[PDB]
Design a protein around this ligand. Structure first.
Ligand SMILES: COc1cc(F)c(-c2nc3c(NCC4CCNCC4)c(Cl)cnc3[nH]2)cc1OC
Length: 265
């Protein structure tokens, strides 16, 4: 897990920031080949935050989740991850307006496969948004950004916080309780983003106005040209009651079946 700084070259290419610090493109010399990487660079609590994120990524092994190469202790603490060259899903759809519905379905279905694995592993993501979905290719999506992620206690199906509010389920906002079903709500917001060509959800609204909207039983309207089946699935992800809301196994299956209806014209 510990990487050699002399084997890492940081490119003059920024992929993200904050916070925290910056994300830079880089190249890491492996045992024989160089690997293209994304390097999360820290610039006291922020150190433990990065190490807990590294500890979460170390435990995960699925084709639809970004792979961590390792950690690097140098000028700054660094988290070295495999590069997804096409970048975030929202930015991609904003700039590539001719992506077919079949293709958007294929991508969000891959996200649902990665989340089904996270659900089975009893980890909660807590930052599941289109900006955190990375494209390896136009037909291959991966879940990234485990900065808010938690390993659930063995005796509880939720993490209690002691925030990307527009992606959060009511139980998160009201009770600070985060479960895999809370990630399903976020997934519904992500699907809305993907079918709105990366438009931000709840445009022009304050967090408190979003809470009020949701509590009155209101939800974002159907994106122009969105398949009805996909909008219906978003509304099922947006079930107020955690108990009636589907888990990722049920979501993955519905997306998979709908994908085959679309693939076969
Ligand atoms: C065309 O514009 C982009 C192309 C890119 F390839 C990338 C990129 N960023 C990462 C990345 N980390 C940072 C992103 C985590 C999710 N939230 C967004 C920033 C990691 Cl871990 C692995 N591959 C990545 N590819 C970013 C881009 O625009 C921000």
């Amino acid at each position: 897990v510990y990487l050699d700084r002399k084997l890492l070259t940081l490119e003059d290419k920024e992929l993200g920031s904050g916070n925290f610090g910056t994300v830079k493109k880089g190249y890491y010399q492996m045992k024989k080949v160089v690997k293209t990487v994304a390097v999360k660079i820290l610039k006291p609590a922020l150190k433990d935050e990065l190490l807990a994120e590294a500890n979460v990524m170390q435990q995960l092994d699925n084709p639809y989740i970004v792979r961590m190469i390792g950690i690097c202790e140098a000028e700054s603490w660094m988290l070295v991850m495999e590069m997804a060259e096409l970048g975030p899903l929202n930015k991609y759809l904003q700039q590539n307006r001719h992506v077919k519905d079949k293709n958007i379905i294929e991508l969000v279905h891959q996200v649902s496969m990665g989340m089904k694995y996270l659900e089975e592993s009893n980890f909660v993501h807590r930052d599941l948004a289109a900006r955190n979905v990375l494209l390896v290719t136009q037909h291959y999506a991966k879940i990234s950004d485990f900065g808010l992620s938690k390993a659930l206690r063995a005796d509880e199906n939720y993490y209690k916080a002691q925030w990307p509010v527009k992606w959060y389920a009511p139980e998160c906002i009201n009770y600070y309780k985060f479960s895999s079903k809370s990630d399903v709500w976020s997934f519904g917001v992500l699907m809305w983003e993907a079918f709105s060509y990366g438009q931000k959800p709840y445009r022009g609204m304050k967090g408190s106005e979003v809470t009020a909207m949701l509590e009155k039983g209101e939800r974002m309207g159907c994106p122009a040209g969105c398949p009805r089946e996909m909008y219906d699935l978003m509304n099922l992800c947006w079930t107020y009651d955690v108990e009636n809301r589907p888990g990722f196994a049920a979501v993955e299956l519905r997306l998979r079946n709908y994908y085959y209806d679309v693939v076969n014209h």
